[PDB]
Amino acid sequence: MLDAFAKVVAQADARGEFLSNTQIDALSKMVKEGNQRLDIVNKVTSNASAIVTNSARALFAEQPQLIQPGGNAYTSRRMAACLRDMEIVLRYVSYAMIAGDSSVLDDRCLNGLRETYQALGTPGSSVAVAIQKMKDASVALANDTTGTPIGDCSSLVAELAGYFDRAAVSVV
Amino acid sequence: MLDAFAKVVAQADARGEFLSNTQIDALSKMVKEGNQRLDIVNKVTSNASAIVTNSARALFAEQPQLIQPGGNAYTSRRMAACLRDMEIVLRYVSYAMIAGDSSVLDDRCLNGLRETYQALGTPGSSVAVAIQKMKDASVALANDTTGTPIGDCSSLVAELAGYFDRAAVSVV
Amino acid sequence: MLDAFAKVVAQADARGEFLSNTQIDALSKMVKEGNQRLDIVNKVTSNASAIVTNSARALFAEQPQLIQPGGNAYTSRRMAACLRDMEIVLRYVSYAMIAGDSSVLDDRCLNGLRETYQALGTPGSSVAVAIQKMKDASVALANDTTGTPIGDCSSLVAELAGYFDRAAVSVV
Amino acid sequence: QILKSTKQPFLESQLRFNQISIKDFIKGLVLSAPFRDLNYNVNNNYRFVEICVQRVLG
Amino acid sequence: RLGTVSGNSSLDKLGLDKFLSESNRAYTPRAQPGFSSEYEQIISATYKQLFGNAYIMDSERAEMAKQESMFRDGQLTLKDFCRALAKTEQYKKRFFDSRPLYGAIELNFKNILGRTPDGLEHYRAKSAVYDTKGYEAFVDAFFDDGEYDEVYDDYTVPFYRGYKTEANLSMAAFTHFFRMVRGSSTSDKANPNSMQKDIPLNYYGITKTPLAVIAPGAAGTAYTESFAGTGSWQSGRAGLNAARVALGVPATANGKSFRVEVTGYTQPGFGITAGTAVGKLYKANKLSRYPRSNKSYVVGFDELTPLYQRITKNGGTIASITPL
Amino acid sequence: MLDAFSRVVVNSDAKAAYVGGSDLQALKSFIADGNKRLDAVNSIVSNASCMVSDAVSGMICENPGLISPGGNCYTNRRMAACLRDGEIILRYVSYALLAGDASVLEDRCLNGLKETYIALGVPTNSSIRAVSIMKAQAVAFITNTATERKMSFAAGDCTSLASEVASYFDRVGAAIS
Amino acid sequence: MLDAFSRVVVNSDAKAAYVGGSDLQALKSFIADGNKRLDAVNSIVSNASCMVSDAVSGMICENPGLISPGGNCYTNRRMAACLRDGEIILRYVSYALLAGDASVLEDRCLNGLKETYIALGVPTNSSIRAVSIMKAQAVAFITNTATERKMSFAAGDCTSLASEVASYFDRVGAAIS
Amino acid sequence: MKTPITEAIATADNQGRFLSNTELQAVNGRYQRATASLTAAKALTGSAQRLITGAAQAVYNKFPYTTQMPGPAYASSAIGKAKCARDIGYYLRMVTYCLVVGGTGPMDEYLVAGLEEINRSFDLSPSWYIEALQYIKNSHGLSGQVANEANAYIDYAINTLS
Ligand SMILES: C=CC1=C(C)[C@@H](Cc2[nH]c(/C=C3N=C(/C=C4\NC(=O)[C@H](C)[C@H]4CC)C(C)=C\3CCC(=O)O)c(CCC(=O)O)c2C)NC1=O
Ligand SMILES: C=CC1=C(C)[C@@H](Cc2[nH]c(/C=C3N=C(/C=C4\NC(=O)[C@H](C)[C@H]4CC)C(C)=C\3CCC(=O)O)c(CCC(=O)O)c2C)NC1=O
Ligand SMILES: C=CC1=C(C)[C@@H](Cc2[nH]c(/C=C3N=C(/C=C4\NC(=O)[C@H](C)[C@H]4CC)C(C)=C\3CCC(=O)O)c(CCC(=O)O)c2C)NC1=O
Ligand SMILES: C=CC1=C(C)[C@@H](Cc2[nH]c(/C=C3N=C(/C=C4\NC(=O)[C@H](C)[C@H]4CC)C(C)=C\3CCC(=O)O)c(CCC(=O)O)c2C)NC1=O
Ligand SMILES: C=CC1=C(C)[C@@H](Cc2[nH]c(/C=C3N=C(/C=C4\NC(=O)[C@H](C)[C@H]4CC)C(C)=C\3CCC(=O)O)c(CCC(=O)O)c2C)NC1=O
Ligand SMILES: C=CC1=C(C)[C@@H](Cc2[nH]c(/C=C3N=C(/C=C4\NC(=O)[C@H](C)[C@H]4CC)C(C)=C\3CCC(=O)O)c(CCC(=O)O)c2C)NC1=O
Numbered sequence A, B, C: 001m002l003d004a005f006a007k008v009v010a011q012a013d014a015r016g017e018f019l020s021n022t023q024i025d026a027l028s029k030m031v032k033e034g035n036q037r038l039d040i041v042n043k044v045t046s047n048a049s050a051i052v053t054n055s056a057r058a059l060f061a062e063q064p065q066l067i068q069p070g071g072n073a074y075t076s077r078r079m080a081a082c083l084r085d086m087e088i089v090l091r092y093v094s095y096a097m098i099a100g101d102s103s104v105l106d107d108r109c110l111n112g113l114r115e116t117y118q119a120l121g122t123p124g125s126s127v128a129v130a131i132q133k134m135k136d137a138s139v140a141l142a143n144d145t146t147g148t149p150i151g152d153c154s155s156l157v158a159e160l161a162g163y164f165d166r167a168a169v170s171v172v
Numbered sequence D: 001q002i003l004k005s006t007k008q009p010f011l012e013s014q015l016r017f018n019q020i021s022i023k024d025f026i027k028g029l030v031l032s033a034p035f036r037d038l039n040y041n042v043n044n045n046y047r048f049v050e051i052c053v054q055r056v057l058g
Numbered sequence E: 001r002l003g004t005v006s007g008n009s010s011l012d013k014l015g016l017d018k019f020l021s022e023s024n025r026a027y028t029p030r031a032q033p034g035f036s037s038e039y040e041q042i043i044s045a046t047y048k049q050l051f052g053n054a055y056i057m058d059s060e061r062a063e064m065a066k067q068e069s070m071f072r073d074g075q076l077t078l079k080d081f082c083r084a085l086a087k088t089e090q091y092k093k094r095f096f097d098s099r100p101l102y103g104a105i106e107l108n109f110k111n112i113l114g115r116t117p118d119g120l121e122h123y124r125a126k127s128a129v130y131d132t133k134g135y136e137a138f139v140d141a142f143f144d145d146g147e148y149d150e151v152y153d154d155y156t157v158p159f160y161r162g163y164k165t166e167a168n169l170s171m172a173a174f175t176h177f178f179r180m181v182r183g184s185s186t187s188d189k190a191n192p193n194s195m196q197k198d199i200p201l202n203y204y205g206i207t208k209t210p211l212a213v214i215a216p217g218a219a220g221t222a223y224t225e226s227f228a229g230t231g232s233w234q235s236g237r238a239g240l241n242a243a244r245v246a247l248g249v250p251a252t253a254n255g256k257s258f259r260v261e262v263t264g265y266t267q268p269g270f271g272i273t274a275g276t277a278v279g280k281l282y283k284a285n286k287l288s289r290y291p292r293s294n295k296s297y298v299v300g301f302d303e304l305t306p307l308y309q310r311i312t313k314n315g316g317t318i319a320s321i322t323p324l
Numbered sequence F, G: 001m002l003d004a005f006s007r008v009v010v011n012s013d014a015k016a017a018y019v020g021g022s023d024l025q026a027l028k029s030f031i032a033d034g035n036k037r038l039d040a041v042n043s044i045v046s047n048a049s050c051m052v053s054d055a056v057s058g059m060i061c062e063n064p065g066l067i068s069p070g071g072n073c074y075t076n077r078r079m080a081a082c083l084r085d086g087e088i089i090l091r092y093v094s095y096a097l098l099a100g101d102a103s104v105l106e107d108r109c110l111n112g113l114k115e116t117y118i119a120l121g122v123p124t125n126s127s128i129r130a131v132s133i134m135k136a137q138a139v140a141f142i143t144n145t146a147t148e149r150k151m152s153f154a155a156g157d158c159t160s161l162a163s164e165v166a167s168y169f170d171r172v173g174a175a176i177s
Numbered sequence H: 001m002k003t004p005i006t007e008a009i010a011t012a013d014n015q016g017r018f019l020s021n022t023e024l025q026a027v028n029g030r031y032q033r034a035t036a037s038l039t040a041a042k043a044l045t046g047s048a049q050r051l052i053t054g055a056a057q058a059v060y061n062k063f064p065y066t067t068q069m070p071g072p073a074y075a076s077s078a079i080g081k082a083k084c085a086r087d088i089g090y091y092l093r094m095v096t097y098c099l100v101v102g103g104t105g106p107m108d109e110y111l112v113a114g115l116e117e118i119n120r121s122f123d124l125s126p127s128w129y130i131e132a133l134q135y136i137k138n139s140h141g142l143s144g145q146v147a148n149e150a151n152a153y154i155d156y157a158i159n160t161l162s
């Protein structure tokens, strides 16, 4: 897979030249968020069970179809199949957030997810709410500076929530 | 696999409710005929190589174009693979005799069997006429009054025909 | 994997008769020209990379967008993998030259090779040029009279040109 | 043990139809009932690991 | 863009938006003189519709400069006008003479009728006319039947119709229809399953076998497996395609079985350390690990999890997954 | 399409025999039981609007996630299509029982509806819960043990016939499976 | 077919959101400076075929051997298809600008253009080298930074929409990357 | 089908190897014995109806019960004797196919694989076919190295029945 440093080298080889000096100080903004990316990982990797409990607490309440006799997640391995599938949409986003792109997100999780739910009959309607119940649950969880100094992180809140909606449109 | 007791479990698990009392007295009728089930499977598998080779011999008599050179069942590789599939249906029919339903015969042996044969090019009308020899060599085998005491088992021989005609309509 | 001798045997067995007298001297013709066929593949295995690097440097001088930065065969991990495909088809035509037929050639190389070249995004018209860039170099040394006694080897190098032509068709 | 009774004639036909792979064919041979009663009932678990690493992993 | 229940519409994102937006009917019983931007739009609509979005330049449109003018008074459209366009050199250069007889038939149904013929008894009725009564009655075998005189009254333009339940074709003719239609940016030639030199559906159109209906423009839709039948009667080979059936003891050992469809792997990707093993990068016999790509697998429900890992850690993209 | 009368012909064709008296004995008893089957299928097609009523309004109360905004029966075209998709598949088995052969069901619809449905995105477990809700809806009508409407037949026992429409509808559900 | 007026109504019908006036202010920002989109569209569709005039001519000056033997734009037939190949995709760029979504370049063009250009052997590097040339060729009429021409404008910052064409030019090299 | 030519291809394909001087003598040595093996194949073809019916009677002289015992696996009837003459004609045909290709390819594929499934099912004895093949071994009437090639592929068939 390729990363956020690699694509401006992938456009330095497939174009074919040396480095422009406007390509070098565009990477200064990557380390203007470089420490500020690193504590954003602490708001999601220290709360791994915390989001996926608090979201599937909510998701069968307004949508009681999943717990019906004859519903989808009925047996306990299918209910454990929800919890192994709710976290990886957040885990590969957590791989995408330390990366800075969505290459490894598309490589190992997303490409092969619309049709895999359709072959199994698990709905594309409600695997997007499992994105959306953890979408607002990490907008609140990462917007607080408990341990780190105070300034501007108004970019990267529109990047990890710039990756959940990428996972939302790649499944419906 | 499913037998007859595994039917009404899964026919009420999506329904949700418990086992109702009006069904199980039909299922405790089935254990009165439990001793007339196991003789009858013992009648088939004791003669399990005399129903195969007596009906492949009466198949190539009426159809000499299969053992002629350039035929489908010509060589010794494809004669052994003709006696292999003639015994495979004799297993999975008698598996469905002991169980009470068809659902291991047409899930492990008949789910794509004619479309196996359209890809290989074997005459799928002609495997049905070997099976209907084995139907008549086994229904008339399971009406002997030696080895068992007499009594009316006319209800249980229609189930043995009803899976032999289910392989007669699977392969065409 | 058939031979020239095994192809006329397998047509006889599916008809179910012995080999005719017109077929044995058709094969007795084929064995007396054996030392011509042993002298052909001795010429195109004693120059089994001097064909290939001189066919690569012919094509790369002609087509220049292969070596361009951004190219298909630009980098040195896609350069030995270009010289791998140029060296195995010189290998696998020479197996099909010594067999007398080309059912070794299409099944061990060319079955779906233009479908894997579709998946890589490889320009396939230029590799068919490179087989034709290898084809005339292969017959220029087959016609080379050095060290061998002189005779007529006319249709054998038209057979060898037909093996390269069958390779160059089904790669585009 | 390439005897007539130790052959697996239904696993052989599914290889020839390209239904299963070689990796699913080796897995059917260790789980074959001739491999249990001849090579698994007559040694313990610390010798059977020496069989399934010498033959499988090579 | 991908979506089934994304905005309540299942087939606008399958590639049939403009084939369901337009209807292309003409409104006057003769083309009126004076104005030449209202009926030339109908002609260049049909020049992409009948030819299958092929490039007709003006250097060959003026070669065919009679046959549209006699439509403007004297021929009907769809019955006579594209019939006259089907008797051209430009129609005979793309869909008749670079390809076999069945491939000329099975591309003519997409061109003329807007469907795919199922089995061979629909190939029987069309190819009983070429070997007896030439090419001009072969093209006019389509235009005077119940399949043509009912769906279009004679002043529309023949659209695509091989997806609806009123077009009572088959259920397999749906599955061939998205092998033939790859969005609105393809042609007869710019189609990977068959170029102009080839035939689209040789086995599958004859034997009525349905296929994996892949949405076009997806991630890794650059896949089609090749063909070699198996068995010793037809002297075929083994190892090219996974089977379409999944019978046996490995049918229901791991639950319900599936057929996956891998797009393709490379040499960088096999290791779990993000690179290439620097060395000789091969074995001695100089083949790949997957020595031909675009391969497929048959796998049960209880091993879908490590196989979906083992494709996706190695650089393989997945076309679709169909249960067997 | 195959007929049961056609089924004994290709049985007698690769065998290369004539028609004997042996396999004729099945078909002459099929004639006199033809009116009893003719007394069956007329009530299948004349209560068909109830059978497509309870096809789709019954399956939606046991999974209401399709009428939810985002589901697979949410819009009023997919609401219209699910009313329409079920009233063709019982029209086909009404053809299939008069021939007696399931091959007319196979070549027309049951060859390839499964490959469309995961590209049309609909779930198959919802479909077989809607297939089997017409299964017991069918077998009440052939026996006259239906509750709210009881129709005119003769007196006998068509439980050989009532297994046959249950022998069709599982293969309706297994085709989508 | 999507646009930015109806991008929200396929978003809000996951929510079943009767749209109170909070989310509509981006649409009230879309109707605010949509004249700058409109004053750029007339700066595109009047200067349209001179974008493609130096597209392939800019490609062939640095990638010279496509007019060589064994090229791709060798003959007159091979070259004139390429000039309609580039003018189709720039026609389909500017549909998306006045609409406001990324609809039209995906649901018609890149619903199958990756298998198109590998069915013909169209080189994907040279068919993005021209479009990267046509990237910066298409920003200069919006910017009015051109060496040769000036368009009669009003003077503001259209840099939200000067890179929005480059934010359509990125996902035309999504599949043909 | 193993031939000498489709075996040295296979060891060349194992090592990624161009056909060296090692694999050009394995295919040359086939050509120095294709002369003697194709006269033996031409001689056995012409004397087929002498050798088939003569070996079918030499079975019946050694094992006289096969012409006497009732039941379908024996040569006691007209059609029982016709299927026995078909079987030795199947056996003698695969000897001549091996002399063409120079090895035991066509009797491996068309004859030997799956043979013991038949001989146990249809109650046919493998010693009925040794006596038929030991007739053909020392009554073909060949000599020299022409006899050496026909006597190699005859007792390959005896060892896969034994
Ligand atoms: C070595 C591992 C490593 C980490 C675990 C993090 C933690 C971390 N963040 C910052 C530094 C910072 N951290 C933030 C982050 C935030 N402030 C906010 O308002 C947001 C709510 C919150 C994001 C969740 C900001 C804005 C700064 C820079 C301080 C400033 O702007 O003046 C610093 C001080 C050094 C520096 O400036 O880089 C450290 C150690 N960074 C790291 O390098
Ligand atoms: C392990 C193997 C095994 C079996 C196969 C059965 C065999 C079996 N059957 C019967 C007993 C019987 N079995 C039959 C059965 C038949 N008579 C017919 O005419 C038909 C040909 C045939 C059915 C297939 C009848 C009619 C009786 C006596 C009635 C009765 O069971 O009460 C009995 C005596 C005990 C009893 O009456 O139940 C036993 C042991 N039990 C076994 O443990
Ligand atoms: C009376 C005068 C007279 C000659 C000199 C030759 C001249 C000559 N040499 C060769 C051709 C040849 N001649 C030889 C023979 C030899 N090469 C050697 O290095 C060995 C010393 C020698 C004997 C083994 C070989 C090996 C070739 C084939 C090589 C080639 O392609 O020229 C040919 C063509 C075919 C042929 O006839 O052989 C001719 C006409 N012929 C004549 O009529
Ligand atoms: C073990 C490895 C091995 C070899 C490398 C060759 C080498 C070789 N070639 C020939 C013999 C020959 N070689 C050729 C071939 C040719 N002559 C030409 O001038 C053409 C360039 C070329 C055609 C392709 C011919 C034509 C003969 C026979 C000479 C003649 O025509 O009288 C002979 C003499 C005996 C024989 O015919 O076999 C030998 C040993 N043979 C082998 O067994
Ligand atoms: C609405 C969407 C839509 C499109 C995008 C185009 C897509 C398209 N492009 C081509 C076809 C082509 N397009 C190119 C173009 C190029 N190759 C290069 O190397 C250059 C970099 C690049 C020019 C910019 C070439 C060379 C052909 C092939 C023409 C030929 O084969 O002679 C064809 C085949 C038409 C035919 O030949 O009949 C089609 C349908 N058409 C559409 O309807
Ligand atoms: C979930 C919401 C819900 C409904 C929409 C109704 C629909 C409904 N009806 C029946 C069950 C049935 N439905 C019918 C159909 C009919 N009866 C007639 O006589 C008419 C002619 C015809 C049109 C109405 C029949 C015959 C039965 C079987 C019961 C019986 O009458 O014997 C069943 C049980 C079938 C099953 O699920 O296995 C359901 C769910 N009931 C509900 O609980």
Ligand SMILES: C=CC1=C(C)[C@@H](Cc2[nH]c(/C=C3N=C(/C=C4\NC(=O)[C@H](C)[C@H]4CC)C(C)=C\3CCC(=O)O)c(CCC(=O)O)c2C)NC1=O
Binding pocket: E009, E010, E011, E163, E164, E165, E166, F055, F056, F072, F073, F077, F078, F079, F081, F082, F083, F084, F085, F086, F088, F089, F108, F109, F120, F122, F123, F126, F127, F130
């Ligand atoms: C042989 C009979 C026969 C059919 C079934 C249909 C097969 C079929 N069904 C649908 C299409 C459909 N079919 C259904 C029905 C259902 N989906 C569900 O979720 C429920 C399980 C089930 C109702 C019981 C729905 C909801 C659509 C979607 C319509 C759409 O996508 O616009 C379409 C697409 C129609 C189009 O694109 O125009 C087709 C071809 N045609 C036929 O000839």
Ligand SMILES: C=CC1=C(C)[C@@H](Cc2[nH]c(/C=C3N=C(/C=C4\NC(=O)[C@H](C)[C@H]4CC)C(C)=C\3CCC(=O)O)c(CCC(=O)O)c2C)NC1=O
Binding pocket: F032, F033, F035, F036, F037, F038, F039, F040, F042, F142, F143, F144, F153, F154, F155, F156, F157, F158, F159, F161
């Ligand atoms: C014009 C339209 C038309 C029809 C409707 C049928 C009418 C019909 N039904 C039956 C006759 C019958 N139908 C049944 C069927 C049944 N009885 C039951 O108890 C079950 C509820 C049900 C299905 C199992 C039975 C048992 C008979 C009597 C046996 C017979 O003679 O067929 C008969 C033969 C006897 C008679 O003349 O009445 C006829 C003609 N045929 C037609 O031509």
Ligand SMILES: C=CC1=C(C)[C@@H](Cc2[nH]c(/C=C3N=C(/C=C4\NC(=O)[C@H](C)[C@H]4CC)C(C)=C\3CCC(=O)O)c(CCC(=O)O)c2C)NC1=O
Binding pocket: G047, G050, G051, G053, G054, G055, G057, G058, G060, G061, G062, G132, G133, G134, G136, G137, G138, G140, G141, G145, G146, G147, G148, G149
């Ligand atoms: C090797 C040969 C060679 C060429 C053919 C040109 C091709 C070319 N043109 C432009 C770039 C451009 N081309 C145009 C097009 C036009 N300007 C107008 O106003 C006219 C209306 C219209 C036709 C003349 C515009 C507006 C730009 C961007 C700015 C500019 O150069 O004016 C660019 C820069 C794009 C980029 O940055 O990637 C290039 C490489 N350059 C070369 O090196």
Ligand SMILES: C=CC1=C(C)[C@@H](Cc2[nH]c(/C=C3N=C(/C=C4\NC(=O)[C@H](C)[C@H]4CC)C(C)=C\3CCC(=O)O)c(CCC(=O)O)c2C)NC1=O
Binding pocket: G032, G033, G034, G035, G036, G038, G039, G040, G042, G142, G143, G144, G153, G154, G155, G156, G157, G158, G159
């Ligand atoms: C049918 C044709 C038709 C149109 C195209 C529009 C024409 C149009 N464009 C703008 C207006 C404008 N256009 C620009 C744009 C720019 N200024 C620059 O120098 C930048 C280079 C460029 C930014 C990309 C700006 C800044 C305005 C004024 C702000 C506004 O959009 O209202 C205005 C508003 C000015 C006014 O109120 O009079 C109008 C009416 N109307 C029409 O009837």
Ligand SMILES: CCC1=C(C)/C(=C/C2=NC(=C\c3[nH]c(/C=C4\NC(=O)[C@H](C)[C@H]4CC)c(C)c3CCC(=O)O)/C(CCC(=O)O)=C2C)NC1=O
Binding pocket: A066, A072, A073, A078, A079, A081, A082, A083, A085, A086, A088, A108, A109, A110, A113, A116, A120, A122, A123, A126, A127, A130, E301, E304, E305, E308, E309, E312
């Ligand atoms: C490599 C990373 C990876 C991905 C992307 C992946 C997808 C994946 N999800 C699966 C199942 C599943 N996924 C779900 C999840 C859901 N269904 C719903 O209705 C809910 C809305 C939703 C969340 C609770 C369920 C219920 C199954 C089991 C399907 C079944 O048994 O019917 C399966 C089948 C095997 C299994 O049960 O795990 C795969 C392969 N698996 C992986 O290992």
Ligand SMILES: CCC1=C(C)/C(=C/C2=NC(=C\c3[nH]c(/C=C4\NC(=O)[C@H](C)[C@H]4CC)c(C)c3CCC(=O)O)/C(CCC(=O)O)=C2C)NC1=O
Binding pocket: B066, B072, B073, B077, B078, B079, B081, B082, B083, B085, B086, B088, B108, B109, B113, B116, B120, B122, B123, B126, B127, B130, D009, D010, D011, D013, D014, D016, D017, E231, E232, E233, E247, E248, E249
């Ligand atoms: C798990 C259970 C199972 C089923 C259901 C099955 C079907 C099956 N039958 C096959 C072949 C075959 N089946 C037949 C049988 C016949 N053809 C005829 O003409 C006769 C009418 C009939 C014999 C009486 C023949 C001749 C082959 C071809 C063997 C070959 O090509 O090698 C093959 C190809 C592999 C092989 O056996 O060679 C499969 C997979 N195989 C199985 O293992």
Ligand SMILES: CCC1=C(C)/C(=C/C2=NC(=C\c3[nH]c(/C=C4\NC(=O)[C@H](C)[C@H]4CC)c(C)c3CCC(=O)O)/C(CCC(=O)O)=C2C)NC1=O
Binding pocket: C066, C072, C073, C077, C078, C079, C081, C082, C083, C084, C085, C086, C088, C108, C109, C110, C113, C116, C120, C122, C123, C126, C127, C130, E265, E266, E267, E286, E287, E288, E290, E291, E292, E293
């Ligand atoms: C079993 C025998 C066999 C077949 C059938 C085969 C096809 C094949 N060709 C490949 C690559 C390739 N093939 C080429 C060849 C060319 N590209 C060009 O521009 C030239 C026109 C042409 C030859 C000079 C190149 C450059 C690659 C590497 C592409 C990549 O790695 O993305 C790959 C990818 C893995 C690899 O690096 O080898 C496969 C599987 N490989 C095999 O080992």
Ligand SMILES: CCC1=C(C)/C(=C/C2=NC(=C\c3[nH]c(/C=C4\NC(=O)[C@H](C)[C@H]4CC)c(C)c3CCC(=O)O)/C(CCC(=O)O)=C2C)NC1=O
Binding pocket: B057, B060, B067, B074, B075, B076, B079, H059, H066, H067, H072, H073, H074, H075, H076, H079, H080, H081, H083, H084, H085, H087, H088, H090, H091, H110, H111, H118, H122, H124, H128, H129, H132
């Ligand atoms: C090419 C490879 C090949 C072989 C070897 C082969 C053998 C073969 N021999 C058979 C029968 C037979 N073979 C014999 C032969 C004999 N019985 C005797 O009494 C004699 C001593 C002896 C002759 C030497 C007889 C009598 C039958 C008929 C058995 C029956 O009808 O049940 C049959 C049963 C079908 C038939 O021919 O009617 C096969 C498949 N088939 C093959 O395709």
